């Protein structure tokens, strides 16, 4: 499930940290991290997305943690681009926004 996706994401990014995934209802987004505690919190709606969209969210959030930034910097996007090349991250973000009408951090 989500756990298996997360392991694949850590392997691709080369990020061996014991990041924990929590599912919690969120108001203002569908996903966010804790840098301090090494967690990714997902709104339950994420669990019903297509696999590539779920994987995007995990990669996006893991990229925040790895790049150690909340700002979507060039080094942030470099991590994302280990999976989603070129224009693909924005395409998948658009799909997720169409479906859920909510943003990830
Ligand atoms: Zn972000």
Q: 3-state SS of the chain?
A: CHHHHHHHHHHHHCCCCCCEEEECCCCCCCEEEECCCCEEEECHHHHHCCHHHHHHHHHHHHHHHHHCCCCCCHHHHHHHCCCCCCCHHHHHHHHHHHHHCCCCC
Determine the Cα–Cα distance for residues 75 and 66; give it in Å rounded to an integer.
9
Q: Please check if 8 is assigned to a binding site.
A: no
Q: Which two tokens stand for residue 31?
A: 């996903």
Domain at 88, CATH number: 3.30.2010.10
Experimental method: X-ray
What is the 101 CA–ligand 1 centroid distance (Å)? 16
Residue 47, token pair as written in the block: 């669990």
Q: How far is ligand 1, taken at its centre, from the CA of residue 60, in Å?
A: 6
Say how many Å lie between the CA of residue 9 and the centre of ligand 1: 16
**70 Cα–ligand 1 center, Å:** 6
Residue 67: domain span: 1-105
Judge residue 27's burial from the number of C-beta atoms within 10 Å of its C-beta, 0-12 exposed, 13-18 middle, 19 or more buried.
exposed
Question: In the chain, how many domains are there?
Answer: 1
């Amino acid at each position: 499930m989500v756990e298996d996706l997360l392991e694949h994401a850590k392997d691709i990014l080369g990020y061996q940290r014991p990041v924990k995934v929590r599912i919690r209802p969120l108001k203002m987004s569908i996903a966010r991290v804790s840098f301090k505690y090494g967690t990714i919190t997902l709104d339950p709606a994420v669990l019903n997305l297509e696999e590539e969209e779920m994987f995007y969210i995990l990669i996006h959030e893991l990229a925040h943690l790895k790049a150690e930034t909340s700002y979507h910097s060039s080094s942030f996007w470099r991590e994302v681009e280990k999976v989603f090349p070129g224009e693909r991250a924005k395409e998948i973000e658009d799909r997720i926004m169409t479906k859920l009408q909510r943003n990830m951090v």
